Amino acid sequence: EDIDVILKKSTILNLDINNDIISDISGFNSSVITYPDAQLVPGINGKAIHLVNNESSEVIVHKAMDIEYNDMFNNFTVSFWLRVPKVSASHLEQYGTNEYSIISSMKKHSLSIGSGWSVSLKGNNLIWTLKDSAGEVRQITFRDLPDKFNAYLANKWVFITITNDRLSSANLYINGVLMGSAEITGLGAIREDNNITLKLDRCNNNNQYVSIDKFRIFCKALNPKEIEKLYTSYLSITFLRDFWGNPLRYDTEYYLIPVASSSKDVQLKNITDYMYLTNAPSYTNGKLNIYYRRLYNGLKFIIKRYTPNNEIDSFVKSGDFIKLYVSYNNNEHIVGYPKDGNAFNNLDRILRVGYNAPGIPLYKKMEAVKLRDLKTYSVQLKLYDDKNASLGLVGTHNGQIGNDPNRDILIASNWYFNHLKDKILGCDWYFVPTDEGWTND
């Protein structure tokens, strides 16, 4: 009765991508069929399934003869990481009322009726549906947050967990927290289809695509304690992740956004000079009750490896030594701190972009690490000097420089190693890459 044990024994279906082949590692050996257009993209711990809106993008799981988990009153839980692009205002108008299924165990235009369960979306609403053998149905309807920067169906990898207890209710969990319930008592036996099909069915927006990962099924209704453990077991601090939950790539551009003040953008005063925070502009839409801070404005950064070692991996791993640069005016400028450059209180060292000065050593050795907030897709950058001593973590500091107005200048500081168990710190950075899953309206 160790949670890890329970989670192991209760698993009767578990899909994992290995060798670019989709398979069931549950032990039960369910037949997994993959159609030509079911594509693989990077995901939470390896690769995920990416389904586009076409008949050829489909994955079919044919359950083992023994894998009977929804008999007369048999409790069950279904989990998976989901990632759906941000719906544009226009599509929210044309397709806001369009409910399309993405995962379902219901045989539709046939001899039977809605077999058993389905997961679908209608606008910015995730839906869980249960249908018994007599055609009775219960549903959970989860309405997403208005602030798309902090929403769940707005382009980030989020862990979905739908538990079902026949004596009480079906609960919807997102990232380990309960967001919706529905009393399912009074529902009869569930007479399902032998196949569990992952596919965009009934979607009228040809550009709708979705990614699903770690589709798993349990023969019991997990409780909070078990969902939390399961949820975090996927958060392995191996590779660092970008703002969407995907792996951090080296020679790729990124926009920085301090998690402590997610409304600010990073700006360059002038080439050989410092960087400071600015206010990101906002999109708002009263009619659709949607709004969010615009992304993609501000300096662009690039992570380069410090030295060529053993193997050239494309993903930045927690602990790798790197060099941060900023693409600007068609050149790439190294970020570092000059031997005796400007600094507040003898400690908070001011960071320079492309600082070029004959005879003055520049400190650039950075270390990308995940020191805190494992549930957040953030990064902490550490700067070192020629002797590999720490100049500190990269964060901000408020003050002036010259006749320049008061600003929150990016600095490097060791102070952060004193205040570190806090929920909000300031040395935490989101790495945001341009993604077609997110367009500003």
Swiss-Prot record:
The chain holds residues 875 to 1315 of 1315 of the full protein. It comes from Clostridium tetani (strain Massachusetts / E88). Disulfide bonds join C203-C219. This is Tetanus toxin heavy chain. The lineage of its organism: Bacteria, Bacillati, Bacillota, Clostridia, Eubacteriales.
